[PDB]
Amino acid sequence: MNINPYFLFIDVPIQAAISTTFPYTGVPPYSTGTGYTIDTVIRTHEYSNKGKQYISDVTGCTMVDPTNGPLPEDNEPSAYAQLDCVLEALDRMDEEHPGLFQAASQNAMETLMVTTVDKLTQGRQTFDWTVCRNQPAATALNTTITSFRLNDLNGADKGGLIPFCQDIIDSLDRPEMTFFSVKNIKKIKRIPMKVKDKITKVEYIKRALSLNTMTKDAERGKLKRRAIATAGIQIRGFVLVVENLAKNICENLEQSGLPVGGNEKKAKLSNAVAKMLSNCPPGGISMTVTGDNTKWNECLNPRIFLAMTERITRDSPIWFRDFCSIAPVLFSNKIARLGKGFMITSKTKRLKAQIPCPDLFSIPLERYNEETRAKLKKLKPFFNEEGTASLSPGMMMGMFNMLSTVLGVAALGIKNIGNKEYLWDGLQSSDDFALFVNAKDEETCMEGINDFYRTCKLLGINMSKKKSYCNETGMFEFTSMFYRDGFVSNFAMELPSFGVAGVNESADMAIGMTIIKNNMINNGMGPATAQTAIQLFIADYRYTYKCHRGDSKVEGKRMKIIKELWENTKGRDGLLVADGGPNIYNLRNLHIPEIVLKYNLMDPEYKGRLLHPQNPFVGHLSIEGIKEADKKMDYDAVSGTHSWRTKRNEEQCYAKCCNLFEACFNSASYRKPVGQHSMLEAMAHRLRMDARLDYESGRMSKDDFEKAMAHLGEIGYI
Amino acid sequence: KGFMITSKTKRLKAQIPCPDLFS
Amino acid sequence: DVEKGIDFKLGQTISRLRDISVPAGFSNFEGMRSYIDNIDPKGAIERNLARMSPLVSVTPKKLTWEDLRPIGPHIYNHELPEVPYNAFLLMSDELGLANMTEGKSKKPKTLAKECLEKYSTLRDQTDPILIMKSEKANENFLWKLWRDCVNTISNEEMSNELQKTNYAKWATGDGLTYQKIMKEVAIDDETMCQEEPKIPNKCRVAAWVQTEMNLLSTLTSKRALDLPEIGPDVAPVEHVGSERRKYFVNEINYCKASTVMMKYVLFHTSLLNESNASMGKYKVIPITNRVVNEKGESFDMLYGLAVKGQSHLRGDTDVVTVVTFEFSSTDPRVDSGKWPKYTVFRIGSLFVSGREKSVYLYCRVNGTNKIQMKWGMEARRCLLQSMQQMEAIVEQESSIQGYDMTKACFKGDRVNSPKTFSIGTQEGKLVKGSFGKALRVIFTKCLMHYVFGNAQLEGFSAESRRLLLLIQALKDRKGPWVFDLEGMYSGIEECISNNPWVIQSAYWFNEWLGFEKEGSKV
Amino acid sequence: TNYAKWATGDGLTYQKIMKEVAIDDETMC
Amino acid sequence: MTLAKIELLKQLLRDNEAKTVLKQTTVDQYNIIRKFNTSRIEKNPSLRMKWAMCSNFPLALTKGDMANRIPLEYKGIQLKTNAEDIGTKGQMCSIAAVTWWNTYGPIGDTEGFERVYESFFLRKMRLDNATWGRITFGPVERVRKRVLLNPLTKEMPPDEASNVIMEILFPKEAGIPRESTWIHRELIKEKREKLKGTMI
C-alpha cells in the first residue's frame, strides 16, 4: 500500500482541512536586490510606455505620464487611467454618502493641526539622504532636523507638523544644502567623524525624491521575490496626512475591508455575503468572484491620486488643499535607488567584485548575463548618471494603502453600467478584492463581471485573470480567510507565534499564555490543541532559559542553583517555571499571571525574596515595555526578580537630557509634562526645592546644601 | 627539496618532500 | 490673530513640480483645480466604455472536470534524472547507536563518547571500504575528517573542538573561495564576467520519497516525544481536553516521524548553541536523541557526527558549512539514484538480536543559516498542525450527536463504528485507514512540508490551492467559472523542478484528481 | 599600489598548502 | 542623590549642546526630545534571547549597593562582574545571581501585594469560587459584539483616568484640579490609602 495525504480530502472538505495545505512550518524564503529593483522599474515603465514621455525641468529626469493616455486594446496591464472616469466614480461615491468627503477632510485637518512632528518617529526604517542609506525613523528624523538647523530652517522646535512640512517645502528652494555626513577617516583604524558637507539644489531635490529599495524576504507564500521601497522623511508627513484622510473616508464605506482587523473583518465578510444573498431576485444567481489583484501598484499613477485628493477636499481651506496635495506631487516625480549593484567574477583567477550601481554602464554590456544585459539595455533611457532610475509612473508597495483601497471601493460602488439587468458590490482591501454580481442567470452575471473588469481597467486597476476565479455565492476566500456555507475557518496561520517573546521570563510567559488564549477565542483552537500548545511552549520556555524542574537530573549553571532551591525551600508548588517549579497553567487560568496564581502556594521566605520592593534586577528605565509587547500587544505581568532586561547590542545630548528630566520629575515618564518655560529652569526650581526639603528633613548635610546651592546659583535660577 | 605539485583550477601549489616521493 | 487663519503657501520648486505633475491635457495645477471643481461628469465612464476595444475582457469560461489535467507532466517522463535526497539529515535510514542509561542527562560529547565506547568495532574502525564517491568530494578528505571526529569525541578532554583545525579547512572547502577585489580592476579587466544564474534541475518522480512517507508514518516500539506536565484539570472542558490530548499522544508518540522530528529539533538546537558559543573554530556535534521504550528505559541514541565550520557571521542570511557523517544500515547500491550527493563507506556490521546487518557511514557536506537554524527548533509546531485539524474533525462529530466521541472516532464504541478515512491505495484500489493512521499521515505531511521546504514548496502550495478550491467548488456543484486556466496551471507547474516533496505532491495530486474524476460519475 | 598588484600580475600567485592536504588531494599534479 | 542630581546637571550643562537645547525646548516640547532614540530594535527577539541566555553575563544590573549582598562568584559559579558598561552604565550579571536571590538574600515585605495587585487577585477569586456545569456539544450561535475584555472598578475616559492616576500617586504636580477629582473623590481616597505603605 502506498500512502497519500491528499486522500484526506476525499473524506473531508478542503476548507475544513485547509490549514494543512499551507506549508507554514518550514523555513520562509530568504535572499542582490538590484536585479529585482531594475526589473520592477522596467515593468512599471513598460506598462505605461505609450503615455506622454517628457523631461522634468526641475530635476532633469525622464517622466512618463499615462493618465488620460490611450485606452488599452489588450488584456495586458494598463496604467492609462482616464481622469473623467475617476471623477465620475468619486462623484457617485459622494452622492451615495451624506457629505462623507467633507466630514473626513475636516476631521483630517483637525487631527493634523493637533499632530506633532514626533509622530514621524513611528513606522519602520526610512531612507536617510544625509547618508543615503536606510536608518531607523527616529534617527533619520533627528538627523534631518539637525541638518535643517544649519540652512536656516526651523519649525521642528515649533512643535506641530504644519511648520515642519512648511520648512520642508521651503528647503527645496535653498540654493545650497549643508549637513553632517559620516566620514570613516583612516588613522590602521577606521574612525567615524562628522564632516560638514554641502550639496546643490538639484542634488538635494533628487535625494528628497529618491526611494530606497530592499528585498521583501520575509514573504512566506510567494516563490518570486518582490522589492519593498522605503521613502525619506520629507514625504512621511504628507503621506501620513493623506493616508489618515483616506482611512477616515474608507472607514465609513461598508465596502472597505480596512482598517478593521480581526473578528471585525469576518463579521463584515459574513454580513456582506448575507446581504447579497438577501438582495438576489427570484430565481436569479448571485455569483462571487474570488479576485487576487496583481500589479496593483505598478499601474496606479500618482496623478490619479492627486486628482482624488483635490476632489475629496472640494470644500476645504485652500491651505489644507495645497498641503494635502503635496504627497501626490512628490510621488509623481519620485526616483528609485538601485540596490547594491551586480557582481562580476572570473573563475580562471578566482576573482570576484561587486559593481556599484553608478558604474552599471561603465562596463560593456556584453559582460553581464544575457538577462541582465536585456534589463540594462531597456533601463538605459531612464538611468540617472548618479545611479538611480527615474520612476515617475506607478507606485511602490505599501505607501497609499488607504487611498488605493478608496479607489477600489469607488470602482466597486458604481454598481451598474448602462442600466443592464444586474448589480454588483463587494469587499476591497489593499490588493485583495472579492466581488458579488447579482443577475437573472449566469450569462448576465458574467456580462456584469466583464463590465466591472473593463471599468477597473479605466482606473489603472487590472484584476489578475490567472489568480482569480468565479463561482456561486456562499464559497470564496478573502485575504486568506475562507468562507463556505456560513463556515469561516480562520486559516490557522498564527502557529509561528508560540516561541518565547524574548523580552524576559515573566513577560515572555504572560505573552505566550495570552497568545494561546487569544488563539482559542479567535481561531477556534480546540481545548486539546491549547493544552498541547501550553505543553510545547513550556518546554521551549524551560529550554531557552536553562531552567528545568529542580528534581530532574539535567545539568547546567543555573540548574545547580535551581536544584539547591528545590530542597532549601519546603513549599514546592509555589516555585515559578523559571525556578524549576511545576507547571500549573491550564485552560481555565490562562488569563491570570502565575505570580498571583502561585501566591498562596509560595513560602513566606520565597515570596519575600522574589517580591522584594527593591531588586537590582529591576530598574525604572526597564519599565518602558511593561505595557505593550512589540504590533503593540497588551500583557499583564508582575514586578519581581524575573522582570529584568537584556544587555544592549546630538544622540547623547537628547538621550541624557530626557533621562535626567525623567529622574528629576518622576511623573514625566508616565504622562506628557505641561509648561511654557525652558526645561532648565523647571529642573533648577525642582532641584532647589528638593535640596531644601532634603536638608529640612535631615537627609542632606549643611556642607552638602551649600555646594548644591552654589551650583544651582551658577545655573541662574536661584 | 623534493618536487612541487600544483592544481591550476584551484590555483594551489604544494611541495612534496623527498621522503614522500612515493606517497 | 483669530481673523487671519493658518498660513501654508507653496514655494517655487514645489509649485513647479505640482505644475508639471498634472495629468495629460493640462498645463497648470490651477487649471486642473478649476476643472475638477467645475466640470461635472454625467456618464463619462459609459462614454469611455462605448469606445474601448471589444478585444479586452475577462474571457469568462465555465470550468468542467475535463479541463482539469494532471499538473507537471514532466515528472512522469523518464528521460529526466531521479530526484536526489537533499534533506539535511537521514530520516528513514538513521541507525541509532543506542545505549541504555539510568536517565541522567549528560553533555552530547560525553554521550557520543560512551556510545562509541560500547561499540568498539565501529569506534576503532580505520580501514574504510568505499561503496561510492559521489561526484566531487574526496574520499581521503572525508575519511580523515571522520577519523578526527571520532578521535576528538573519544578523547579524554571534555573539549569538543577539532584538534587538527587545518585539514578540516580543506576538507570542508572553506579555503576554496574567491578573493574580492576593488571595482576599478574589475572594470578594467575583460575576463571578469557575471555568472549565469544556476536554475534547478528538472527531475522525475523518485521512489525513496514514497517509501519514506510510508515508513515514517508507522508505529514503533520506541517513543521519544515527551511533553511537560500542566496543572490539574478541574473544569469539565479541560477534562475533555485532557482525554483528547492523551488519545492523540498515545498515537503520535510511537510513529517514527515523531522521532525524526525530535532528532531534527535537537540537532538544530545544538547547532545554534555551538554557533553562538563557538564562532571561529571548527566544532564536533553529535546528532543525539533520547528514546524511551514502553518499559521506561531511557536509551540515548547517537545517530552520527557533524563538523561545524567557522560560523563567525554578523548577519543571519550568511551561510555556515557543516559536514554530516551518519550511521545507516542501508547499502546505497540497492538504489543508487537516491544517493548522488553522498560519499559513503562500510564501517562494519552489528547484531540487533542475532540477525547481522551491515553498518555504513554516509558523509556529505552541506550548508545552513541562522534562519533555518532557528526554524529547526521551531519544527515542533508540526505537532500542533496535526492536532488542530483532527480536533476540528472530532468536534464536528460531537456536533452531530451530543456526547463526546474521541473514544468512538479512535477506537469506536458499541453504538458507533471506528472512524476510517481514505489513506492509500494499491493496484488501483484505494484503502481506508484508522483515525490514528490518518493523524499520523497528517503529521508526516507537516513534517515533510518542513524538511523539504524552500521557495519552490511555497510557490507550489500557494498556487495549487487555487486548483484545490476549484475542485472543492466543483464537488459542491457550484459551477465555478475560470478566466485563464492555463495561466494558473503554468504558475503551479513552474515550481516542480527539483524538490522531492514538490514532485511527490504533484504525483499524489494527479492520482487523487484521477480518483475524483472516476468517482464524479455519481 | 592596490591597482598595480593586479596590473603586474603579482596577485595571481598560487597559494601554498600543507603537504598532508596536497597528498590527500588527487587533483594536484 | 539630589547632590548627585545637581552634579550630573552641571556636568551635562558644561557642554554647549546641552545648554542650548535645555534653554530652547520648553517643558511641553520635552516629549519630542524623548522620542529621538536610536530605534535599532532587535530584528529577531527569539534568537537574541537564546544567544543572551548562553552568555556569561547577559543581565544588565543597575549600579547600586545590592551587589555586595552576593559575591562576584558563589560556590565556584560566576554571578556578577565589576567591568564598566556603556549601554546602561551599570554592571553585568547572570541568571545564576537571580536564582540565588530567589533562594537566599534579603526578605522583603508581603503587605503590598494584598492590595496593590487587587485586580489580579480579584480575577483569581472569581476563578476559584466559580461553579462549573455540563458541556453542550451542540452547535452554538455566536454574534460579534463590542465587549469589555476585563471588569473595571470605575470606567472613565482615558484623560480622566490619567488625571486620577496622577492625583493618586503623584502628590506633586497637581495644579488646579479639574472637574474630575470631585467626581472620583472616593476612588482617589480609597486607592491612596490602599497604596500607601508600599515601595514599588
Residue numbers in the entry:
A (entry chain B): 1 to 31, 34 to 189, 201 to 643, 652 to 670, 684 to 752
B (entry chain D): 353 to 375
C (entry chain A): 195 to 716
D (entry chain E): 359 to 387
E (entry chain C): 1 to 200
Sentences copied from the publication:
In the nucleus of the infected cell, influenza polymerase (FluPol) uses the viral genomic RNA (vRNA) as template to perform synthesis of either capped and polyadenylated viral mRNA (transcription), or unmodified anti-genomic copies (complementary or cRNA), which then serve as the template for vRNA synthesis (replication). ANP32 is required for both vRNA to cRNA and cRNA to vRNA replication. ANP32 comprises a folded, N-terminal leucine-rich repeat (LRR) domain followed by a Glu-, Asp-rich intrinsically disordered region known as the low complexity acidic region (LCAR).
Further refinement focussed on the replicase or hANP32A-encapsidase moieties improved the map quality and estimated resolution to 3.3 Å, enabling relatively complete models to be built. In the FluPolB replicase there is a rotation of ~15° of the PA-ENDO(R) towards the PB2-627(R) domain when compared to the FluA replication complex, allowing the FluPolB PA-ENDO(R) 63–73 insertion to contact the PB2-627(R) domain in the region of W575, a contact not observed in FluPolA replicase. Conversely, in the replicase, the PA-C(R) 609-loop interacts with the PA-C(E) arch domain, reinforcing the replicase-encapsidase interface. The FluB replication complex is only seen as part of a trimer (determined at 3.57 Å resolution overall), with an additional monomer, FluPolB(S), making a symmetrical FluB-type dimer interface with the replicase. FluPolB(S) is less well ordered with only the core visible and not the peripheral domains, likely due to flexibility. For FluPolB, based on the observed trimer structure, where the third FluPolB forms a different symmetrical interface with the replicase, we speculate that it could have a distinct role. It might assist in replication termination by binding the replicase and releasing the 5’ hook of the template so it can be copied.
